[PDB]
Amino acid sequence: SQGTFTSEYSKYLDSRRAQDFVKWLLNT
Amino acid sequence: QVMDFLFEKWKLYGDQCHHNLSLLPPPTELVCNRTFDKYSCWPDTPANTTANISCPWYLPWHHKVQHRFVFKRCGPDGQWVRGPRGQPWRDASQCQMDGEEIEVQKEVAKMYSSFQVMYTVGYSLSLGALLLALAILGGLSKLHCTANAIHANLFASFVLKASSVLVIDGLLRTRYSQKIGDDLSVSTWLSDGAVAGCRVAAVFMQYGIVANYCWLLVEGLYLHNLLGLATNIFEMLRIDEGLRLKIYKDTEGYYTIGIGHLLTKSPSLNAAKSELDKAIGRNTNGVITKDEAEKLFNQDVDAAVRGILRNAKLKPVYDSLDAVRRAALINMVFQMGETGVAGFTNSLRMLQQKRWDEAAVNLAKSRWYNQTPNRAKRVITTFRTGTWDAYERSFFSLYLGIGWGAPMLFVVPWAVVKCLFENVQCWTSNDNMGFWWILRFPVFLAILINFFIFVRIVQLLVAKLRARQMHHTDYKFRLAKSTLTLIPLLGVHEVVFAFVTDEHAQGTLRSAKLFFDLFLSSFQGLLVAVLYCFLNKEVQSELRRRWHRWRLGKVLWE
Ligand SMILES: *[C@@H]1O[C@H](CO)[C@@H](O[C@@H]2O[C@H](CO)[C@@H](O)[C@H](O)[C@H]2NC(C)=O)[C@H](O)[C@H]1NC(C)=O
Ligand SMILES: *[C@@H]1O[C@H](CO)[C@@H](O[C@@H]2O[C@H](CO)[C@@H](O)[C@H](O)[C@H]2NC(C)=O)[C@H](O)[C@H]1NC(C)=O
Numbered sequence: 001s002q003g004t005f006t007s008e009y010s011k012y013l014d015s016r017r018a019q020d021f022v023k024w025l026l027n028t
Numbered sequence: 029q030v031m032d033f034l035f036e037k038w039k040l041y042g043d044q045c046h047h048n049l050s051l052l053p054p055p056t057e058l059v060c061n062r063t064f065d066k067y068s069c070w071p072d073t074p075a076n077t078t079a080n081i082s083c084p085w086y087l088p089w090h091h092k093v094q095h096r097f098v099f100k101r102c103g104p105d106g107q108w109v110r111g112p113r114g115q116p117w118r119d120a121s122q123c124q125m126d127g128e129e130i131e132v133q134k135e136v137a138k139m140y141s142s143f144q145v146m147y148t149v150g151y152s153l154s155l156g157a158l159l160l161a162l163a164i165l166g167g168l169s170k171l172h173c174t175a176n177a178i179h180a181n182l183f184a185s186f187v188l189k190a191s192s193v194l195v196i197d198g199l200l201r202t203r204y205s206q207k208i209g210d211d212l213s214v215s216t217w218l219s220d221g222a223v224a225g226c227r228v229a230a231v232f233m234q235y236g237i238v239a240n241y242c243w244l245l246v247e248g249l250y251l252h253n254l255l256g257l258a259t260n261i262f263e264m265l266r267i268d269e270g271l272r273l274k275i276y277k278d279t280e281g282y283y284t285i286g287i288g289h290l291l292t293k294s295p296s297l298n299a300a301k302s303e304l305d306k307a308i309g310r311n312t313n314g315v316i317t318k319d320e321a322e323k324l325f326n327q328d329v330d331a332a333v334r335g336i337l338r339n340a341k342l343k344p345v346y347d348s349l350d351a352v353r354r355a356a357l358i359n360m361v362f363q364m365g366e367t368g369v370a371g372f373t374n375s376l377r378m379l380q381q382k383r384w385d386e387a388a389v390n391l392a393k394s395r396w397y398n399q400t401p402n403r404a405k406r407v408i409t410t411f412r413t414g415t416w417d418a419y420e421r422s423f424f425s426l427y428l429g430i431g432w433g434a435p436m437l438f439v440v441p442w443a444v445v446k447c448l449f450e451n452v453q454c455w456t457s458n459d460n461m462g463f464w465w466i467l468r469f470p471v472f473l474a475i476l477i478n479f480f481i482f483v484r485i486v487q488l489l490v491a492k493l494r495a496r497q498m499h500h501t502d503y504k505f506r507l508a509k510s511t512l513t514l515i516p517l518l519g520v521h522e523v524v525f526a527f528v529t530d531e532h533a534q535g536t537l538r539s540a541k542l543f544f545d546l547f548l549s550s551f552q553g554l555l556v557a558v559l560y561c562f563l564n565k566e567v568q569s570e571l572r573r574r575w576h577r578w579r580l581g582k583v584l585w586e
Contacts, residue, residue, distance in 0.1 A: 003458035
């Protein structure tokens with residue numbers, strides 16, 4: 001399940017970064 | 029691909045926002061001129077009035093927030109309402125993602141970090157044990173034997189798997205810890221990034237995973253081999269001296285059959301026939317089968333053992349030996365004689381002192397090594413290793429091909445498919461990913477093959493144990509033990525976690541169930557390390573002896 005966990009984690013990190021780019025669009 | 033999709037879609041919004049604004053007519057009243065405040069597209073808005081446009085389609089959560097709106101107030105002075113520090117200001121409060129999801133995401137962030145430290149510990153200690161086990165085997169120069177060479181390569185695969193998992197989690201921190209600087213920083217981050225390293229490391233993990241399956245199959249294969257290939261004292265001398273079924277003549281002149289068994293010292297070959305009939309109890313004309321010869325040879329060893337015990341120089345060393353090294357001693361008493369082997373005083377002393385390495389060096393410095401180097405190499409190996417490995421045909425070249433060749437056949441084709449058709453995030457995705465089966469097929473085939481050989485091994489071990497053929501002290505039993513625990517240890521794990529990880533629905537329950545499987549499997553390196561190195565009696569003995577030579581060195585002298 002290692003690969004499947006590392007997967008879901010990176011899927012998360014990416015979605016987490018995507019919303020943080022929207023914070024950058026709202027502040028500048 | 030969410031960060032990649034959004035940046036492409038926002039650049040598209042940015043491009044087509046400027047075009048959409050260009051085609052607008054010039055004003056007729058006091059207006060806030062057309063703008064793109066880097067978040068949304070605003071047209072010419074009359075003074076005092078607040079403008080309202082639908083949420084920007086580039087947003088990942090646009091599907092949900094689709095019908096809501098973003099607001100912006102136009103000042104009565106003609107210029108847009110600015111922020112606190114005179115910055116572009118707007119009300120995209122109802123364009124924000126669900127408040128419930130932000131809290132849930134904060135919870136998954138805690139468990140991903142909590143689970144990471146836990147399995148990182150498991151992988152670290154199982155890798156630590158592995159490197160120490162490889163250091164021990166290597167250091168004691170015990171990596172010569174076919175068994176240890178297999179174990180070392182099995183250890184190497186568990187090192188590769190465990191170490192590449194830590195590298196992937198490490199690179200993911202390094203990449204996602206970075207800040208969204210500007211659009212230039214994002215462009216450099218996505219395009220000119222070390223996203224390649226993530227994926228190179230993923231290929232090593234995938235290879236690690238399959239090579240683990242293959243190197244465990246060669247453990248089952250090597251054991252299935254050893255158990256069938258039942259090498260004994262008779263077998264080593266059938267090679268060293270040679271079996272002769274017919275009535276032959278010895279170097280001294282007298283008649284001798286099989287492995288130098290004397291019938292009569294006299295030159296009467298007619299009388300020798302009547303002497304051979306006395307042993308088995310029936311007429312044979314002058315020829316005996318393999319079963320008749322080994323039953324008669326077992327009298328010669330029983331006669332040679334008797335003499336060694338009667339000998340004051342040979343009895344101390346004989347008793348301080350295992351059944352395999354005793355065979356090597358009984359073997360050289362067969363070629364040299366009893367008085368001849370007693371001449372090896374210095375070598376026999378260190379052979380009694382269990383100093384197998386230096387005993388093997390000066391046994392090769394002997395006049396006996398020069399006369400017969402072929403036969404000497406084999407018995408010198410038997411004393412050095414305590415195994416019949418020198419008298420058995422090795423399939424080690426095949427084992428490397430199975431262990432490292434077979435995963436090669438499936439990981440690189442997978443890595444090509446991945447490179448072209450599924451080049452997303454870190455490539456670690458293992459189940460129901462479309463062409464997941466490229467990497468699952470070799471592992472399914474290895475568990476299936478390893479299952480049938482296990483049954484064959486236990487069938488042949490039960491039979492050999494019931495026949496008192498294998499004693500609980502023979503190295504083959506000790507190897508059989510650690511191999512026949514490891515296979516059901518890993519086997520049961522697969523079966524159990526097939527039902528445990530049946531949670532398909534995305535959540536924290538699914539994540540913890542996924543963690544449960546991978547966490548318990550993180551210690552696997554430590555399992556193979558203890559079973560094939562740390563619990564090895566011969567390794568434990570050599571380390572115990574090399575420690576007592578250190579206890580006398582730096583304490584008594586220095
Ligand atoms: C009117 O809105 C637009 C926003 O892009 C701007 O108008 C341009 O002003 C430049 C001079 O700086 C002219 O060369 C262009 O011809 C104008 N664009 C068009 C299509 O008219 C400006 O920021 C705003 N202010 C006004 C009143 O021009
Ligand atoms: C966006 O703002 C506009 C204001 O221009 C809203 O449109 C006006 O709503 C009035 C209601 O009395 C209607 O006369 C017309 O539909 C619009 N005015 C004219 C004459 O064009 C619009 O409703 C807002 N959009 C939303 C729903 O956010």
